[PDB]
Structure formats: structure tokens, C-alpha cells
Short mmCIF file of N, CA and C and ligand atoms in Angstrom, two decimals:
data_model
loop_
_atom_site.label_atom_id
_atom_site.label_comp_id
_atom_site.label_asym_id
_atom_site.label_seq_id
_atom_site.Cartn_x
_atom_site.Cartn_y
_atom_site.Cartn_z
N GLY A 1 -19.40 29.30 59.22
CA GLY A 1 -19.88 30.19 58.13
C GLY A 1 -20.17 29.38 56.89
N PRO A 2 -20.34 30.06 55.75
CA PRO A 2 -20.79 29.31 54.57
C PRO A 2 -19.65 28.73 53.74
N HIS A 3 -18.46 28.61 54.31
CA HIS A 3 -17.32 28.10 53.55
C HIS A 3 -17.00 26.63 53.90
N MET A 4 -15.72 26.25 53.89
CA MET A 4 -15.31 24.86 54.07
C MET A 4 -15.29 24.46 55.54
N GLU A 5 -15.28 23.15 55.80
CA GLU A 5 -14.94 22.68 57.14
C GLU A 5 -13.61 23.25 57.63
N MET A 6 -13.55 23.61 58.90
CA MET A 6 -12.35 24.18 59.50
C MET A 6 -11.10 23.31 59.30
N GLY A 7 -11.23 22.01 59.51
CA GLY A 7 -10.09 21.12 59.32
C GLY A 7 -9.55 21.15 57.91
N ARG A 8 -10.45 21.26 56.93
CA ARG A 8 -10.04 21.33 55.53
C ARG A 8 -9.35 22.66 55.25
N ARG A 9 -9.88 23.75 55.80
CA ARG A 9 -9.26 25.08 55.65
C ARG A 9 -7.84 25.03 56.18
N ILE A 10 -7.67 24.41 57.34
CA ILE A 10 -6.36 24.32 57.95
C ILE A 10 -5.42 23.46 57.10
N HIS A 11 -5.90 22.33 56.61
CA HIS A 11 -5.06 21.46 55.79
C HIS A 11 -4.57 22.19 54.55
N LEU A 12 -5.41 23.06 53.99
CA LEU A 12 -5.01 23.79 52.78
C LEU A 12 -3.93 24.80 53.12
N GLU A 13 -4.03 25.41 54.30
CA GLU A 13 -2.99 26.35 54.74
C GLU A 13 -1.67 25.63 55.03
N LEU A 14 -1.74 24.33 55.33
CA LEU A 14 -0.54 23.56 55.68
C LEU A 14 0.06 22.78 54.52
N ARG A 15 -0.49 22.93 53.32
CA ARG A 15 0.13 22.32 52.16
C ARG A 15 1.50 22.97 52.01
N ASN A 16 2.53 22.14 51.92
CA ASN A 16 3.90 22.60 51.67
C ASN A 16 4.57 23.28 52.87
N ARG A 17 3.95 23.23 54.05
CA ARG A 17 4.65 23.62 55.27
C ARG A 17 4.15 22.82 56.46
N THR A 18 4.65 23.14 57.65
CA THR A 18 4.24 22.46 58.88
C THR A 18 3.61 23.46 59.83
N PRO A 19 2.84 22.97 60.81
CA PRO A 19 2.20 23.88 61.77
C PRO A 19 3.17 24.84 62.48
N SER A 20 4.38 24.40 62.78
CA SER A 20 5.30 25.25 63.55
C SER A 20 5.78 26.46 62.74
N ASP A 21 5.54 26.44 61.43
CA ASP A 21 5.91 27.55 60.54
C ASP A 21 4.91 28.72 60.56
N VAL A 22 3.68 28.46 60.98
CA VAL A 22 2.58 29.40 60.78
C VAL A 22 2.54 30.51 61.83
N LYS A 23 2.50 31.77 61.38
CA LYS A 23 2.43 32.91 62.29
C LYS A 23 1.03 33.48 62.45
N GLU A 24 0.26 33.43 61.37
CA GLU A 24 -1.11 33.95 61.33
C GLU A 24 -2.01 32.96 60.62
N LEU A 25 -3.23 32.81 61.13
CA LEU A 25 -4.19 31.89 60.55
C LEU A 25 -5.57 32.51 60.57
N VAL A 26 -6.17 32.67 59.39
CA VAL A 26 -7.51 33.23 59.29
C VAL A 26 -8.45 32.10 58.91
N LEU A 27 -9.29 31.70 59.85
CA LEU A 27 -10.24 30.61 59.60
C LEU A 27 -11.67 31.11 59.46
N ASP A 28 -11.82 32.42 59.32
CA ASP A 28 -13.12 33.08 59.24
C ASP A 28 -14.04 32.39 58.24
N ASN A 29 -15.29 32.17 58.66
CA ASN A 29 -16.37 31.63 57.83
C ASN A 29 -16.26 30.14 57.53
N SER A 30 -15.23 29.47 58.03
CA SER A 30 -15.19 28.02 57.97
C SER A 30 -16.20 27.47 58.95
N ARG A 31 -16.42 26.17 58.85
CA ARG A 31 -17.41 25.50 59.69
C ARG A 31 -16.73 24.70 60.79
N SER A 32 -17.01 25.07 62.03
CA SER A 32 -16.54 24.34 63.17
C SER A 32 -17.18 22.96 63.21
N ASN A 33 -16.62 22.10 64.05
CA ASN A 33 -17.12 20.76 64.23
C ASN A 33 -18.23 20.74 65.26
N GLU A 34 -19.47 20.94 64.81
CA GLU A 34 -20.62 20.98 65.70
C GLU A 34 -20.35 21.92 66.88
N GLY A 35 -19.79 23.09 66.57
CA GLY A 35 -19.57 24.10 67.58
C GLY A 35 -18.18 24.15 68.18
N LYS A 36 -17.33 23.18 67.84
CA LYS A 36 -16.01 23.05 68.45
C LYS A 36 -14.90 23.29 67.45
N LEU A 37 -13.78 23.80 67.95
CA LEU A 37 -12.58 23.91 67.15
C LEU A 37 -12.11 22.53 66.70
N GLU A 38 -11.57 22.46 65.49
CA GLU A 38 -10.92 21.25 65.01
C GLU A 38 -9.71 21.62 64.19
N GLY A 39 -8.69 20.78 64.23
CA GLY A 39 -7.54 20.94 63.37
C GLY A 39 -6.42 21.73 64.00
N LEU A 40 -6.73 22.42 65.09
CA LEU A 40 -5.75 23.21 65.82
C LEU A 40 -5.12 22.36 66.90
N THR A 41 -3.80 22.30 66.90
CA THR A 41 -3.05 21.49 67.86
C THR A 41 -1.93 22.31 68.48
N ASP A 42 -1.24 21.73 69.46
CA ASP A 42 -0.13 22.42 70.12
C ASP A 42 1.13 22.43 69.26
N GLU A 43 1.04 21.87 68.05
CA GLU A 43 2.15 21.95 67.10
C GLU A 43 2.31 23.38 66.56
N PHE A 44 1.28 24.21 66.75
CA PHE A 44 1.29 25.59 66.28
C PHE A 44 2.05 26.51 67.25
N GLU A 45 3.33 26.20 67.46
CA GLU A 45 4.14 26.84 68.49
C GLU A 45 4.53 28.29 68.19
N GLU A 46 4.38 28.71 66.94
CA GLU A 46 4.79 30.05 66.54
C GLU A 46 3.61 30.95 66.20
N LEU A 47 2.40 30.43 66.35
CA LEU A 47 1.20 31.17 65.99
C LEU A 47 0.98 32.37 66.91
N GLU A 48 0.89 33.55 66.31
CA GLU A 48 0.72 34.79 67.05
C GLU A 48 -0.65 35.43 66.85
N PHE A 49 -1.30 35.13 65.72
CA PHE A 49 -2.62 35.65 65.40
C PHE A 49 -3.54 34.54 64.91
N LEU A 50 -4.71 34.41 65.54
CA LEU A 50 -5.70 33.44 65.14
C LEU A 50 -7.07 34.10 65.05
N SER A 51 -7.72 33.96 63.90
CA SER A 51 -9.02 34.55 63.65
C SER A 51 -9.99 33.42 63.31
N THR A 52 -11.07 33.29 64.09
CA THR A 52 -12.12 32.32 63.77
C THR A 52 -13.49 32.99 63.81
N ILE A 53 -13.64 34.04 63.01
CA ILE A 53 -14.88 34.78 62.93
C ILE A 53 -15.95 33.97 62.20
N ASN A 54 -17.16 33.93 62.75
CA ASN A 54 -18.31 33.32 62.07
C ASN A 54 -18.03 31.87 61.65
N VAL A 55 -17.66 31.03 62.62
CA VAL A 55 -17.45 29.61 62.35
C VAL A 55 -18.46 28.73 63.10
N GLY A 56 -19.49 29.36 63.67
CA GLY A 56 -20.52 28.64 64.39
C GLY A 56 -20.05 28.11 65.74
N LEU A 57 -19.05 28.76 66.30
CA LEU A 57 -18.41 28.28 67.53
C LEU A 57 -19.30 28.44 68.74
N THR A 58 -19.38 27.40 69.57
CA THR A 58 -20.15 27.48 70.80
C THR A 58 -19.29 27.23 72.04
N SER A 59 -18.05 26.78 71.86
CA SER A 59 -17.17 26.49 72.98
C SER A 59 -15.74 26.69 72.53
N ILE A 60 -14.86 27.17 73.41
CA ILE A 60 -13.43 27.23 73.09
C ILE A 60 -12.65 26.21 73.89
N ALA A 61 -13.34 25.18 74.38
CA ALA A 61 -12.70 24.20 75.25
C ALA A 61 -11.63 23.37 74.52
N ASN A 62 -11.72 23.27 73.20
CA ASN A 62 -10.73 22.52 72.43
C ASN A 62 -9.56 23.36 71.92
N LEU A 63 -9.35 24.54 72.50
CA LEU A 63 -8.20 25.36 72.15
C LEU A 63 -6.95 24.67 72.67
N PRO A 64 -5.93 24.50 71.81
CA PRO A 64 -4.69 23.88 72.28
C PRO A 64 -3.79 24.89 72.95
N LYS A 65 -2.71 24.42 73.59
CA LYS A 65 -1.68 25.33 74.09
C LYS A 65 -1.05 26.08 72.91
N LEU A 66 -1.09 27.40 73.00
CA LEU A 66 -0.53 28.30 72.00
C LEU A 66 0.24 29.40 72.72
N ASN A 67 1.48 29.10 73.11
CA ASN A 67 2.19 29.98 74.03
C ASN A 67 2.62 31.30 73.40
N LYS A 68 2.64 31.37 72.07
CA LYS A 68 3.02 32.60 71.41
C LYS A 68 1.83 33.43 70.93
N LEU A 69 0.61 32.95 71.17
CA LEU A 69 -0.57 33.64 70.66
C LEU A 69 -0.76 35.01 71.34
N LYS A 70 -0.84 36.07 70.54
CA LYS A 70 -1.00 37.42 71.04
C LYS A 70 -2.39 37.98 70.75
N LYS A 71 -2.95 37.62 69.60
CA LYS A 71 -4.24 38.16 69.20
C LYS A 71 -5.20 37.03 68.83
N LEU A 72 -6.39 37.05 69.42
CA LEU A 72 -7.40 36.03 69.18
C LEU A 72 -8.72 36.71 68.83
N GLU A 73 -9.21 36.47 67.61
CA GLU A 73 -10.47 37.05 67.17
C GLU A 73 -11.54 35.96 67.08
N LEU A 74 -12.57 36.10 67.93
CA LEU A 74 -13.63 35.11 68.06
C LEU A 74 -14.99 35.70 67.69
N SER A 75 -14.97 36.81 66.98
CA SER A 75 -16.19 37.56 66.71
C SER A 75 -17.24 36.73 65.98
N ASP A 76 -18.50 37.10 66.18
CA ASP A 76 -19.61 36.57 65.41
C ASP A 76 -19.77 35.05 65.57
N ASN A 77 -19.69 34.61 66.82
CA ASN A 77 -19.94 33.23 67.18
C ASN A 77 -20.94 33.19 68.32
N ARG A 78 -21.07 32.04 68.97
CA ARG A 78 -21.99 31.90 70.08
C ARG A 78 -21.30 31.46 71.37
N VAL A 79 -20.09 31.96 71.59
CA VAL A 79 -19.39 31.66 72.82
C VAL A 79 -20.10 32.37 73.97
N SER A 80 -20.32 31.66 75.07
CA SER A 80 -21.05 32.20 76.20
C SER A 80 -20.37 32.01 77.54
N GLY A 81 -19.15 31.46 77.53
CA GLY A 81 -18.48 31.16 78.78
C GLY A 81 -17.27 30.30 78.52
N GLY A 82 -16.73 29.72 79.58
CA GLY A 82 -15.54 28.89 79.46
C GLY A 82 -14.26 29.65 79.20
N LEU A 83 -14.25 30.94 79.48
CA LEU A 83 -13.12 31.79 79.12
C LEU A 83 -11.89 31.54 80.01
N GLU A 84 -12.04 30.75 81.07
CA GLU A 84 -10.90 30.38 81.90
C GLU A 84 -9.83 29.61 81.11
N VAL A 85 -10.25 29.01 80.00
CA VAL A 85 -9.34 28.23 79.15
C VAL A 85 -8.21 29.10 78.61
N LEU A 86 -8.50 30.37 78.34
CA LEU A 86 -7.50 31.25 77.74
C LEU A 86 -6.27 31.44 78.63
N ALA A 87 -6.49 31.63 79.92
CA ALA A 87 -5.36 31.81 80.82
C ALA A 87 -4.48 30.56 80.87
N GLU A 88 -5.06 29.40 80.61
CA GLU A 88 -4.31 28.16 80.62
C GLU A 88 -3.59 27.91 79.30
N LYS A 89 -4.26 28.22 78.21
CA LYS A 89 -3.81 27.83 76.88
C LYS A 89 -3.08 28.93 76.10
N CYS A 90 -3.49 30.19 76.28
CA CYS A 90 -2.77 31.30 75.65
C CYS A 90 -2.50 32.41 76.67
N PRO A 91 -1.61 32.11 77.62
CA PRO A 91 -1.38 33.01 78.75
C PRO A 91 -0.73 34.34 78.36
N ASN A 92 -0.16 34.43 77.16
CA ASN A 92 0.49 35.65 76.68
C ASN A 92 -0.38 36.53 75.78
N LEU A 93 -1.67 36.20 75.70
CA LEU A 93 -2.61 36.97 74.89
C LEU A 93 -2.66 38.45 75.28
N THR A 94 -2.66 39.33 74.28
CA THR A 94 -2.72 40.78 74.51
C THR A 94 -4.00 41.42 73.97
N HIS A 95 -4.58 40.81 72.93
CA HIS A 95 -5.77 41.35 72.28
C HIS A 95 -6.80 40.24 72.10
N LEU A 96 -8.02 40.49 72.57
CA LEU A 96 -9.11 39.52 72.45
C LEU A 96 -10.37 40.19 71.92
N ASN A 97 -10.93 39.64 70.84
CA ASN A 97 -12.17 40.16 70.26
C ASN A 97 -13.29 39.16 70.41
N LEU A 98 -14.26 39.51 71.26
CA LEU A 98 -15.43 38.66 71.50
C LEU A 98 -16.72 39.29 70.96
N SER A 99 -16.60 40.29 70.10
CA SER A 99 -17.75 41.00 69.57
C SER A 99 -18.77 40.05 68.96
N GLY A 100 -20.04 40.34 69.17
CA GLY A 100 -21.09 39.54 68.57
C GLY A 100 -21.22 38.12 69.07
N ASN A 101 -20.82 37.86 70.32
CA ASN A 101 -20.98 36.55 70.97
C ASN A 101 -22.03 36.67 72.07
N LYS A 102 -22.22 35.61 72.85
CA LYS A 102 -23.29 35.55 73.84
C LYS A 102 -22.70 35.88 75.20
N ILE A 103 -22.07 37.05 75.28
CA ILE A 103 -21.49 37.54 76.53
C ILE A 103 -22.50 38.44 77.23
N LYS A 104 -23.10 37.95 78.31
CA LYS A 104 -24.30 38.58 78.87
C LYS A 104 -24.07 39.35 80.17
N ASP A 105 -23.01 39.02 80.89
CA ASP A 105 -22.77 39.61 82.20
C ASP A 105 -21.30 39.68 82.53
N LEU A 106 -20.97 40.38 83.61
CA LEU A 106 -19.58 40.53 84.03
C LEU A 106 -18.98 39.21 84.50
N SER A 107 -19.78 38.33 85.10
CA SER A 107 -19.23 37.08 85.60
C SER A 107 -18.60 36.26 84.46
N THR A 108 -19.14 36.39 83.25
CA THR A 108 -18.65 35.66 82.09
C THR A 108 -17.24 36.07 81.70
N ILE A 109 -16.91 37.35 81.87
CA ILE A 109 -15.57 37.80 81.50
C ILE A 109 -14.63 37.94 82.69
N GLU A 110 -15.12 37.64 83.89
CA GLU A 110 -14.27 37.67 85.09
C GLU A 110 -12.99 36.83 84.93
N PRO A 111 -13.05 35.63 84.31
CA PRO A 111 -11.82 34.83 84.11
C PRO A 111 -10.73 35.54 83.30
N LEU A 112 -11.09 36.57 82.54
CA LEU A 112 -10.06 37.30 81.80
C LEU A 112 -9.10 38.04 82.72
N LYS A 113 -9.43 38.15 84.01
CA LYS A 113 -8.52 38.81 84.94
C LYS A 113 -7.21 38.04 85.10
N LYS A 114 -7.20 36.77 84.68
CA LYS A 114 -6.01 35.92 84.81
C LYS A 114 -5.05 36.06 83.63
N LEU A 115 -5.46 36.82 82.62
CA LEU A 115 -4.58 37.12 81.50
C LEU A 115 -3.74 38.35 81.79
N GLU A 116 -2.55 38.10 82.32
CA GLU A 116 -1.68 39.16 82.81
C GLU A 116 -1.34 40.23 81.77
N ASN A 117 -1.27 39.83 80.50
CA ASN A 117 -0.80 40.72 79.43
C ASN A 117 -1.93 41.30 78.60
N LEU A 118 -3.17 41.03 79.00
CA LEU A 118 -4.30 41.49 78.20
C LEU A 118 -4.35 43.02 78.19
N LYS A 119 -4.34 43.59 76.99
CA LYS A 119 -4.30 45.04 76.81
C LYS A 119 -5.58 45.60 76.20
N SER A 120 -6.21 44.80 75.34
CA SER A 120 -7.32 45.23 74.52
C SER A 120 -8.40 44.16 74.46
N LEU A 121 -9.63 44.57 74.76
CA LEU A 121 -10.79 43.69 74.75
C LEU A 121 -11.92 44.34 73.96
N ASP A 122 -12.50 43.60 73.02
CA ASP A 122 -13.68 44.09 72.27
C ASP A 122 -14.90 43.23 72.54
N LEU A 123 -16.00 43.90 72.85
CA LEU A 123 -17.27 43.26 73.16
C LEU A 123 -18.41 43.90 72.35
N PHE A 124 -18.11 44.50 71.19
CA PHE A 124 -19.14 45.22 70.42
C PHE A 124 -20.41 44.39 70.24
N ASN A 125 -21.55 45.00 70.56
CA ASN A 125 -22.89 44.43 70.31
C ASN A 125 -23.22 43.19 71.16
N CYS A 126 -22.40 42.91 72.18
CA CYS A 126 -22.72 41.89 73.19
C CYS A 126 -23.69 42.44 74.22
N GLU A 127 -24.51 41.56 74.77
CA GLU A 127 -25.52 41.97 75.74
C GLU A 127 -24.90 42.72 76.92
N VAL A 128 -23.67 42.38 77.28
CA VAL A 128 -23.05 42.96 78.46
C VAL A 128 -22.86 44.48 78.26
N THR A 129 -22.78 44.93 77.00
CA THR A 129 -22.54 46.35 76.73
C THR A 129 -23.76 47.20 77.09
N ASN A 130 -24.88 46.56 77.40
CA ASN A 130 -26.10 47.26 77.79
C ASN A 130 -26.20 47.48 79.30
N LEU A 131 -25.26 46.95 80.06
CA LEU A 131 -25.30 47.13 81.51
C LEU A 131 -25.03 48.59 81.85
N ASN A 132 -25.67 49.08 82.91
CA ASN A 132 -25.40 50.43 83.35
C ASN A 132 -23.95 50.49 83.82
N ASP A 133 -23.28 51.59 83.50
CA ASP A 133 -21.88 51.79 83.84
C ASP A 133 -20.99 50.65 83.31
N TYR A 134 -21.31 50.16 82.12
CA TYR A 134 -20.60 49.06 81.48
C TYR A 134 -19.09 49.27 81.44
N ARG A 135 -18.65 50.38 80.84
CA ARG A 135 -17.21 50.60 80.66
C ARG A 135 -16.51 50.71 82.00
N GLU A 136 -17.10 51.46 82.92
CA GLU A 136 -16.51 51.65 84.25
C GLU A 136 -16.34 50.31 84.95
N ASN A 137 -17.38 49.49 84.91
CA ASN A 137 -17.35 48.23 85.63
C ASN A 137 -16.40 47.22 85.01
N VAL A 138 -16.23 47.25 83.69
CA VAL A 138 -15.30 46.33 83.06
C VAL A 138 -13.87 46.71 83.43
N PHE A 139 -13.55 48.00 83.44
CA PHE A 139 -12.18 48.42 83.76
C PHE A 139 -11.84 48.11 85.23
N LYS A 140 -12.84 48.15 86.11
CA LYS A 140 -12.60 47.78 87.50
C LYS A 140 -12.39 46.27 87.66
N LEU A 141 -13.10 45.49 86.86
CA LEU A 141 -12.96 44.03 86.83
C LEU A 141 -11.63 43.59 86.26
N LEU A 142 -11.18 44.31 85.24
CA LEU A 142 -9.98 43.96 84.50
C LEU A 142 -8.98 45.09 84.59
N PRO A 143 -8.35 45.24 85.76
CA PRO A 143 -7.50 46.40 85.96
C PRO A 143 -6.26 46.44 85.06
N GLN A 144 -5.89 45.32 84.45
CA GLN A 144 -4.71 45.31 83.59
C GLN A 144 -5.02 45.85 82.19
N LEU A 145 -6.30 45.94 81.86
CA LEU A 145 -6.74 46.37 80.54
C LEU A 145 -6.44 47.84 80.25
N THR A 146 -6.05 48.14 79.01
CA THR A 146 -5.84 49.52 78.59
C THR A 146 -7.03 50.00 77.75
N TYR A 147 -7.46 49.18 76.80
CA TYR A 147 -8.49 49.56 75.84
C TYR A 147 -9.68 48.62 75.91
N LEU A 148 -10.87 49.20 75.86
CA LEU A 148 -12.12 48.44 75.79
C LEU A 148 -12.89 48.98 74.60
N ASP A 149 -13.25 48.10 73.68
CA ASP A 149 -13.93 48.51 72.46
C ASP A 149 -13.17 49.63 71.77
N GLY A 150 -11.84 49.54 71.83
CA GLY A 150 -10.99 50.44 71.08
C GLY A 150 -10.43 51.67 71.78
N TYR A 151 -10.85 51.96 73.01
CA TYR A 151 -10.34 53.14 73.66
C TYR A 151 -10.41 53.08 75.18
N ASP A 152 -9.85 54.12 75.80
CA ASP A 152 -9.64 54.27 77.25
C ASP A 152 -9.80 52.99 78.03
CL1 CL B 1 2.04 32.67 58.40
#
């Protein structure tokens, strides 16, 4: 987004504390490193909420292990795949927001079936929401899910 580099945003949040202290981190509108996460490490052992809205993200492959992460907001980026990383890196995730990304088909979100605790998924304004029987087919793909785009 039109703000600071992501690494600089993170360093400012870490003035006078350490990564293991942080519970929530809002990196919205910072600038990713040519499409990639930067500054996030596995030292963030207590992080439960991470927001990286509008950071120009094109890949989540550099997501570190975040075993306590419950909510991940990735809205308004250009993520188009690679979602298998979440089951490896944040296996306890319960809420995922992918609204406004390049999610075009069911195959792209099929890896979310490996997130045992996933309860809520948002895909607002993604191409996949234009598929016939979109809601029905997503719930069949992701039987553990309770809410899609906020309901049923
Ligand atoms: Cl915090």
C-alpha cells in the first residue's frame, strides 16, 4: 500500500519489546518485498492475529511457523495460490480472509481442507464467488467450515 516498507512497520512495532510479546499485528498498507512477506519470523510465538491488507502481496510462501495464529487477514492483495502453506505454518487457524485476491476456482482453495480448525472463510469479490452454486460447492469442499462470507 502507500505506507512504509513492511520490515520498517514491524521494527516500529517492536521498539521496546520482542517478537514473542506480540499478540496482534496490523501491517495493512505497508509495502511487501516485491510481493513477499518480510520481517515476520518464527519468533512470533504468541501472535494470534495478523493483518496484511493491501501490501501488494503475491505469495504467502515466506510465512513463518506461527502456531498460535487464529486469524489471518490477507484482503486486497494478489494471492492466487500456494495456500497449502497455511496448514504447515498456521495449523490452528480459525478465521481466514482472502477477499479481493486472485482466487479464481475451487482447486485454489482445496488446500484449506487441511486446516482442521478453520471456522470462517471470506472470499468477497473474488472471481470464485461467480461460480454457479458457489456457496454450496465451497461448503462441500470444506466440510469443517461453519461460515462463508459471514454466514451459514
Ligand atoms: Cl500486541
